[PDB]
Design a protein around this ligand. Structure first.
Ligand code: JQG
Ligand code: A1AMO
Ligand code: MN
Length: 1774
């Protein structure tokens, strides 16, 4: 051992590594600060271990301790060196691992000592990756430190490569810590920089225009009125005016104004200014003369291009150049010399309508060129197109209208104001001129979609929010987005389908869009933020407004990129598109809620009568705002109709107050909807709506005020619906309590039946005011010890089973900015300690009574630590330590400070912190952190315990206990979730998965619930119940637990304590009824339970007398909780932490956050894994969406499996197609014989038959059979034992044309007569001893008489097609008389070809004929040698029962393929153990029954080099269907039947015909090529069993009647027949599991495991009885025990027997009696241990679950050694 200097800056001081070093007995000196070269911490040090050291060691230290400085870097070096390594391992897609290396004089460039490869998942968050990485580096240390310190590890140098990263290189990706890996990479692809851009723009516009004028000189360029201009005519006239302009003084970047109207001269003037060198400044001639003067002066334009009509509007302010004066045009018609550069200004357009007078946005040439060069190839603009110059030339819409199409050879058509506003006449012009492409603003576009157009192929829109996609035309609709500051548009979207929010699209050429937060950091995909524009569209800025330009055009502080601040909110969608979410300022507050009014219009337009809609948010002088819904419809729509229409998907405040009908929306002069021309509502006054009905009496007013107080709404109406206007379950109780003060008693259920004030009055009008309904909580007087509540006693008892358990520790974190004072937070928390007695309460035990003791003051543990992002979790994990309930405060806190945040953490116990208590702690801490004063508390928890303990003596309490005792009487339901194998003892290890319901779906969920008089909890509980039922094999009843607030007295809603109560919920799902029906059923069962919600759970269990198993939890195993929305802002930024704990098998908590729902899936990791839960989360989402849209659909019609799961099943199971030769088997033999005539084909006894000899004898009997009247699909029955004649018969039947029907010769005549009839067959090819056995049925031949053969040895002609019958195998199945399965040739061929592909029988191979030919397996032996041209060794009759003989055949005949039904393989392997003969055997193909798991090793030990295979298949799928290859080193838990064969498909379906997902059981169904034609002469049965199904798209499926389940591997597991299913108390019983467990003991070799119906037709499993139960007590659950198959020895056991008999109540207790079998509860163990402690016998309550008997726990209860003598025994006074 030696001294180690542990260097850590961001990790803990007592990490797992330091402790492992201290266990190996090292002295670990820990230094967290910078060490100096000659410090004391450096003396007498033998090793230096570093872990997250945030300093650099001096070069002397590195050299002085060279080879002795070890670092722990959580990265696979050389990759991701430096800082934040795990994140950069994911973002840069580098290899993943951990490295223990040596420290040099640089950053992580040392010789690697040991290195492991970690693996991160796609569904893992970055935080999960941090945790996984930190563990690996700590385990790698524990695993290799001894090899390192002892020099057993040779350092190898770092390989070439790697990345190096520094601190603050991550400041842009800070909001991405809770994002999954695949999502992180998706954002990277979607937002990263490409490859140094495309190509730089090296051209101006006039340059490219002059190149197009040379390409299409004589094409029409512009068309105004009836006259036209060609490209060359336009170019030359512009060139003429440009020579005039340039000579007049136009220089680059100069601003020349144009005040012309839409004409041919406007296009000439625009190109003239450009060719001269300037930028055109469009001034609309109709603008106010002041606006005109402003632009001219702001633009500092010396030259104005106008005419004589608009001349005087300049007031002599510029050099007027008349565009009609000929002297203004020169004689030079040639292209001017170029004086411009791509960075030169091209135009300046003024934008206004808001703050400021008007700002001049300046655009450059490279900006426009980049747009025009993207426009042409994107829309396929050709010289054949015609475009419309629609927008005013003062708006960038005209830039698109003019410049984009000019660069493509198209023709511009000028639009006079005569048609710009008559859009019927515009459609005329377009249709009669062939206008193919144009840009129409949103409002004008939505009013052009009604016109009937045939000319347009592409119509682009944008400007406002597009809602309408239905149009009377054949043109494509495109939606664009872009500010004027960038060029025209930056994103485009093709509207392909209806959308609620039509995306604005994807960025264009050389343009990138980022969604950033307030700190200018990258938001994750789907998270909203401000849109930022990067690329070649961004212009210079604003004219003479440098402040606003620096404000909106910012260079990013981190990415170093110029970006434009849009001020618009948007989010990226997963497809790569962006969607506009509104302006970051245009949110109004309604009823106290900030909303976007544009989120309402889409729902209103979905009304079948509304075509156009617009929602405005006007206000009154009082200040409050109201929403007005303007709509265009054929006629007016009733107000209540629009209110109801929106009530299906929207909340009350998002429903507009008033609606206004319009015939046509007024449009501004630029194609937008004139919002300020929309009629203002007359009744703005104060009209609380047309729905407002004022209270008409004193009670309606009294109720309306109480409703106002509880709901927060002013002036309620007598028709307002409680649940529709914010009503919650908590608010219902608040209404009830506020009514008790009035004197009126209302029941919880009566509110849901009277949800308006109108109805409530009728309920309460006859009541009389009764005083005393609400009695104050009496403040207890001072005592030494106080009373504890029922929950506090429970929680105490829980923490006593494992005194070191953290399963009920409550850990929350809040991330504060670094500007918060850490000590201020601690001071506030120390104020919260004295403010609440719970934070100073301790719990002790007085005899057998748990009591509370209040302490006047307690000191808080406030640990300050420094850490990094990838270490915060690790630091916090080492701080969750067990709590001693006798010590206060029961809360520990601390602040972890990083370089970007201060993370406050606090850890409490459930005994004090519950749901509401957390919300009060939030609000109070937030108020204290704001230095706000708090009114001192008024009540205390210790008083509520007194009141409630007295209520337990009331009559109401007994009334409620009786409810639960009858509710949970009788056999309760059993919810068998598709879990992993349940561990014997209960485990609490867990993880969490999270599912987010978006705000849109959340809104539809709540609106749906309120509309049908339900709460969101009721609606969620129903979906959860259906979800559980569909996993419990579509059970009709389900059971689960829930949690209530538990605040009985209304005075306890401000206290800090444990109030919540756990309730058992027994609900029912009717799959034959609708979702709406089931919703009411759940409520009809929830409300009675909430009426008896104040009985403690332990008493409910006792009233129900619930049996205690060990694999499951008491009454339920799945828990569903729900929390409301956060009350404060601190509560919304609190984060609950799971320490890897799952109190139940599965817990679902719904949390309302961010206007959506965060659903947590806490699960036991021993029962579910990462993949399983992910499947269940997607199934819940699938059911939720199906339900919220299928309110009236039957629940059976909701499918649990998902489409992704269906595709996954297909590949892993049912992708089995293979092309197989259609040559029949009877031909194959005759072909083989012709080529190998003298090769061995059959071997019987010691005689051999060759292919030629076989074939020839076959041919003879065939020629005989042919003239006997044998044609295709004829049946001739066989009566023969194993011989060569049976083989000749079969093949001859097939050559003649018929099908062969094997009948056992030794079958009773009763049977034969049956098949003789059912088949209706005539020929009976029988052997000599059985010719008369046919009783001369019809024509009976003799296979042994040569008369029944013929002379012709030539191959009979082919007379069969691949669809003809080849054989008919009767079934004689259970509960049935023999039925004839008809198998065709191509069916048999497929199995033979597929089995050969798997187990090929080649020429040098052989099969053994040992299966009786009345079983289909024999067919695989009869024909399995033909494909590969092998041979068949016919075993002697009745030798299948002699393993001696079977073995001999394998040895002497070199057999490779053999079939063995299980139970006949065991006698075979019991013979081969004491044997050593050589073998050629290759495959043991097993089928017929389930393979015992013990058989697999038994086989591979007597026959190594063999390949054991388990194969399954019903007779109706020819022979086989699925197979599973077993391996030597394997221990399959049920031994699966496997995956289907080639061209086979297997489906597991439920009782309603739906594909079951993995784990969920159902009926196995076969489909594919090798299916039976049907049952012979039983078309009834053929219809019930061979049914068409949508899975096979009308093709048939065979219902096997076998229960089966899919496996994560994909292999199907056999679960038995659907009938003959054994269930104890609703749980399925697998008799093999109990047999397997009853066999591994040497004493037992014979294991009988079966069920007997007993007493009232009830069933019970039958097979040392209590010892046998003990052997099965472990491993097996108490529903799987066979119902049918006093001696204390030391003082301790006598003492234990006495104490047990008192607590358990069993007068007679034995040392071998099971605690839980005698009534052992968790309550009992505490009593037993406490009575033992009082007599100095220390016993652990946990031990009672591991050692449940007296003698088993006897050596574990220790004595408390007492000291009898004192230090002072004799005293002498002096
Ligand atoms: P209605 O809306 O149909 O009401 C149904 C309920 C859910 C029964 C309602 O009445 C109710 O009681 N809501 C509050 C229940 C509650 O307290 N939920 C949170 C419970 N969880 C905890 O107390 C702990 N862990 C996580 O929350 C705690 C340590 C924070
Ligand atoms: P014992 O074998 O441990 O069981 C008997 C008890 C009644 C003591 C035990 O089952 C019990 O306490 N059940 C109720 C506790 C419970 O289900 N949840 C705890 C309450 N807190 C939460 O559920 C999380 N918010
Ligand atoms: Mn490092």
């Amino acid at each position: 051992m030696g001294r180690i200097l542990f260097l850590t800056t961001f990790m803990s001081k007592g990490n797992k590594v330091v402790r492992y070093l201290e266990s190996l007995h090292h002295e670990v000196v820990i230094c967290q600060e910078k060490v100096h070269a000659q410090s004391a911490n450096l003396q007498e040090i033998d090793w230096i271990v570093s872990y997250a050291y945030g300093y650099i060691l001096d070069k002397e230290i590195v050299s002085r301790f060279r080879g002795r400085i070890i670092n722990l870097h959580p990265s696979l070096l050389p990759w991701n060196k430096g800082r934040d390594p795990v994140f950069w391992s994911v973002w840069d897609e580098t290899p993943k691992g951990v490295t223990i290396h040596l420290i040099d004089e640089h950053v992580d460039t040392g010789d690697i000592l040991v290195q492991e490869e970690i693996a991160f998942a796609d569904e893992d968050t970055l935080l999960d990756c941090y945790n996984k990485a930190n563990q690996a580096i700590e385990e790698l240390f524990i695993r290799e430190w001894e090899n390192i310190v002892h020099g057993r590890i040779a350092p190898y140098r770092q390989t070439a490569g790697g990345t190096l990263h520094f601190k603050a290189d991550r400041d842009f990706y800070k909001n991405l810590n809770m994002t999954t890996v695949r999502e992180l990479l998706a954002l990277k692809r979607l937002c990263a920089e490409p490859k140094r851009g495309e190509k730089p723009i090296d051209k101006t516009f006039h340059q490219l225009f002059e190149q197009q004028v040379e390409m299409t000189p004589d094409h029409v360029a512009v068309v105004d009125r009836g006259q036209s201009l060609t490209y060359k005519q336009l170019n030359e006239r512009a060139n003429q005016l440009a020579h005039h302009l340039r000579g007049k003084g136009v220089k680059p970047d100069d601003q020349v104004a144009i005040m012309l109207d839409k004409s041919l001269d406007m296009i000439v003037s625009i190109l003239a200014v450009m060719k001269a060198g300037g930028a055109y400044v469009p001034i609309d001639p109709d603008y106010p003369g002041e606006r005109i003067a402003y632009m001219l002066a702001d633009s500092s334009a010396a030259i104005l291009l106008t005419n004589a009509l608009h001349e005087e509007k300049a007031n002599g302010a510029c050099d007027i150049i008349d565009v009609h004066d000929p002297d203004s045009y020169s004689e030079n018609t040639n292209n001017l010399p170029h004086v411009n550069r791509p960075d030169d200004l091209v135009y300046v357009m003024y934008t206004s309508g808001s703050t400021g007078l008007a700002k001049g946005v300046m655009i450059e040439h490279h900006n426009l060129v980049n747009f025009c060069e993207w426009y042409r190839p994107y829309f396929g603009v050709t010289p054949a197109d015609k475009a419309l110059v629609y927008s005013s030339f003062s708006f960038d819409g005209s830039a698109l209208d003019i410049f984009t199409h000019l660069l493509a050879g198209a023709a511009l058509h000028i639009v006079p104001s005569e048609r710009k506003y008559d859009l019927d006449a515009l459609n005329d012009y377009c249709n009669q001129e062939g206008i193919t492409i144009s840009y129409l603003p949103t409002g004008a576009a939505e009013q052009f979609m009604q016109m009937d157009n045939q000319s347009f192929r592409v119509v682009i829109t944008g400007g406002d929010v597009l809602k309408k996609i239905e149009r009377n035309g054949t043109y494509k609709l495109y939606n664009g987005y872009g500010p004027t500051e960038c060029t025209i548009m930056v994103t485009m979207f093709e509207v392909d389908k209806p959308y609620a929010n039509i995306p604005i699209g994807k960025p264009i050429d050389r343009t990138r869009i980022l969604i950033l937060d307030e700190a200018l950091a990258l938001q994750p995909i789907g998270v909203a933020g401000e849109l930022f524009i990067v690329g070649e569209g961004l212009g210079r800025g604003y004219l003479n407004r440098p402040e606003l330009t620096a404000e909106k055009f910012i260079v990013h502080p981190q990415t170093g990129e110029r970006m434009y601040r849009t001020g618009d909110r948007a989010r990226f969608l997963p497809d790569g598109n962006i969607e506009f979410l509104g302006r970051l300022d245009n949110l109004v507050k309604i009823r106290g809620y900030r909303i976007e009014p544009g989120e309402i219009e889409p729902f209103l337009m979905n009304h079948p009568l509304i075509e156009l809609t617009t929602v405005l948010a006007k206000e009154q002088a009082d200040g409050r705002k109201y929403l007005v819904g303007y709509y265009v419809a054929p006629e007016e729509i009733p107000h209540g109709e629009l209110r109801e229409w929106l009530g299906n998907d929207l909340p009350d405040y998002m429903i507009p107050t008033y609606f206004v009908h319009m015939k046509a929306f007024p449009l501004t002069a630029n194609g937008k909807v004139d919002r300020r021309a929309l009629p203002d509502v007359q009744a703005d006054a104060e009209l609380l709506g047309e729905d407002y009905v004022a209270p008409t009496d004193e009670l309606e007013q009294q109720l309306a005020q109480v409703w106002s107080h509880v709901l927060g709404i002013p002036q309620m109406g007598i028709d307002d619906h409680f649940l529709e206007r914010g009503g919650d379950s908590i608010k219902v109780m608040q209404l009830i309590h506020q009514l008790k003060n009035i004197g009126l008693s209302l029941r919880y259920d009566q509110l849901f039946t009277h949800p308006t004030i109108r109805q409530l009055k009728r309920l309460l009008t006859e009541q009389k005011q009764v005083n005393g309904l609400l009695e104050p909580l009496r403040e207890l007087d001072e005592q030494a010890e106080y009373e504890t509540s029922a929950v506090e006693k429970r929680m105490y008892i829980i923490q006593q089973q494992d005194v070191e358990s953290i399963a009920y520790n409550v850990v929350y974190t809040i991330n504060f900015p670094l500007t918060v004072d850490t000590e201020q937070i601690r001071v506030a928390l120390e104020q919260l300690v004295l403010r609440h007695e719970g934070l100073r309460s301790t719990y002790h035990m007085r005899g057998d009574e748990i009591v509370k003791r209040i302490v006047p003051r307690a000191e808080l543990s406030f640990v300050r630590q420094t850490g990094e992002e990838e270490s915060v979790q690790s630091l916090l994990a080492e701080q969750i330590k067990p709590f001693d309930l006798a010590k206060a405060p029961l809360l520990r806190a601390g602040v972890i400070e990083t370089a970007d945040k201060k993370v406050l953490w606090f850890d409490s116990h459930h005994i004090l912190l519950d749901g509401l208590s957390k919300s009060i702690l939030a609000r109070e801490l937030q108020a204290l952190l704001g230095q706000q004063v708090l009114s001192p508390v008024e009540k205390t928890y210790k008083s509520f315990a007194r009141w409630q303990n007295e209520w337990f003596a009331s009559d109401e309490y007994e009334q409620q206990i009786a409810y639960w005792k009858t509710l949970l009487q009788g056999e309760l339901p059993a919810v068998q979730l598709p879990t992993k194998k349940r561990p014997p003892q209960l485990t609490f290890d867990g993880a969490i998965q999270m599912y987010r319901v978006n705000p849109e779906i959340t809104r539809k969920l709540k609106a749906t619930a309120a509309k049908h008089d339900l709460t969101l909890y009721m609606l969620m509980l129903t979906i959860v119940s259906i979800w559980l039922s569909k996993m419990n094999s579509d059970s009709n009843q389900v059971i689960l637990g829930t949690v209530t607030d538990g605040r009985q007295h209304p005075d306890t809603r401000e206290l800090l304590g444990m109030f919540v109560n756990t309730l058992p919920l027994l609900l029912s799902i009717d799959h034959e009824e609708s979702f709406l029906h089931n919703l009411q059923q759940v409520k009809a069962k929830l409300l009675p339970a909430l009426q008896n919600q104040y009985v403690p759970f332990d008493k409910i269990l006792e009233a129900a007398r619930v049996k205690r198993e060990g694999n499951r939890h008491p009454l339920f195993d799945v828990m569903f909780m729900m929390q409301g929305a956060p009350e404060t802002e601190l509560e919304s930024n609190m984060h609950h932490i799971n320490a890897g704990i799952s109190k139940f098998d599965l817990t679902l908590e719904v949390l309302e956050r961010e206007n959506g729902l965060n659903i947590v899936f806490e699960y036991n990791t021993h029962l579910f894994d990462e993949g399983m839960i992910l499947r269940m989360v997607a199934q819940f989402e699938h059911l939720l969406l199906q339900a919220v849209h299928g309110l009236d659909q039957q629940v059976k019609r909701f499918e649990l499996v998902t489409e992704d799961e269906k595709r996954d099943l297909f590949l892993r199971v049912n992708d089995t197609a293979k092309a197989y030769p259609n040559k029949l088997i009877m031909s194959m033999l005759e072909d083989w014989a012709a080529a190998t005539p003298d090769k061995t084909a059959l071997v019987f006894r010691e005689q051999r038959v060759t292919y030629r000899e076989l074939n020839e004898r076959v041919n003879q009997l065939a020629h005989t059979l042919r003239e006997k009247g044998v044609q295709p699909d004829d049946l001739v029955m066989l009566m023969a034992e194993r011989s060569v004649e049976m083989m000749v018969a079969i093949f001859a039947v097939l050559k003649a044309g018929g099908a062969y029907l094997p009948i056992d010769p030794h079958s009773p005549a009763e049977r034969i007569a049956y098949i003789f009839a059912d088949s209706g067959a005539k020929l009976v090819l029988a052997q000599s001893p059985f010719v008369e056995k046919a009783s001369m049925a019809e024509v009976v031949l003799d296979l042994n008489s040569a008369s029944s053969y013929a002379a012709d040895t030539s191959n009979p002609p082919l007379v069969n097609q691949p669809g003809d019958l080849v054989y008919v195998m009767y079934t004689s199945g259970s509960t049935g008389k023999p039925k004839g399965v008809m198998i065709e040739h191509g069916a048999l061929l497929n199995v033979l070809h597929g089995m050969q592909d798997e187990y090929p029988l080649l020429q040098d191979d052989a099969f053994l004929l040992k299966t009786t030919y009345i079983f289909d397996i024999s067919v695989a032996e009869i024909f399995g040698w033909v494909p590969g041209r092998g041979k068949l060794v016919i075993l002697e009759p009745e030798a299948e029962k002699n393993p001696k003989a079977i073995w001999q055949a394998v040895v002497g005949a070199g057999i490779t393929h053999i079939n063995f039904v299980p139970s006949m393989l065991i006698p075979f392997v019991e013979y081969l153990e004491g044997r050593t003969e050589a073998n050629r055997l290759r495959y043991i193909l097993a089928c017929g029954e389930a393979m015992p798991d013990e058989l697999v090793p038994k086989v591979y030990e007597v026959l190594p080099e063999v390949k054991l295979e388990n194969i399954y298949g019903p007779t109706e799928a020819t022979i086989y269907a699925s197979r599973y290859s077993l391996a030597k080193g394997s221990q399959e838990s049920p031994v699966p039947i496997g995956k289907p064969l080639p061209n086979y498909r297997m489906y597991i379906i439920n009782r309603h015909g739906q594909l079951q997902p993995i784990g969920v059981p159902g009926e196995l169904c076969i489909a594919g090529a090798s299916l039976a034609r049907g049952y012979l002469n039983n078309p009834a049965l053929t219809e019930e069993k061979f049914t068409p199904h949508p899975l096979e798209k009308g093709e048939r499926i065979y219902r096997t009647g076998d229960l089966a389940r899919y496996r994560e591997d994909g292999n199907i597991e056999y679960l038995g027949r659907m009938d003959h299913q054994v269930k104890i108390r609703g749980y399925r019983i697998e008799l093999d599991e109990i047999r397997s467990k009853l066999i591994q003991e040497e004493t037992i070799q014979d294991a009988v495991v079966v069920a007997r119906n007993d007493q009232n037709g009830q069933a019970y499993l039958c097979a040392t009885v209590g010892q046998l139960r003990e052997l099965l007590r472990r491993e097996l659950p108490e529903y799987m025990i066979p119902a049918h198959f006093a001696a204390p020895r030391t003082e301790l056991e006598a003492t234990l027997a006495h104490i047990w008999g008192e607590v358990l109540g069993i007068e007679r207790i034995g040392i071998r009696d099971n605690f839980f079998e005698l009534g052992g509860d968790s309550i009992k163990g505490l009593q037993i241990a406490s009575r033992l402690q009082r007599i100095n016998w220390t016993m652990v309550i946990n031990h009672l679950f591991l050692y449940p008997t007296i003698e088993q726990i006897a050596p574990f209860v220790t004595s408390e050694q007492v000291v009898i003598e004192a230090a002072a025994e004799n005293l002498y006074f002096q």
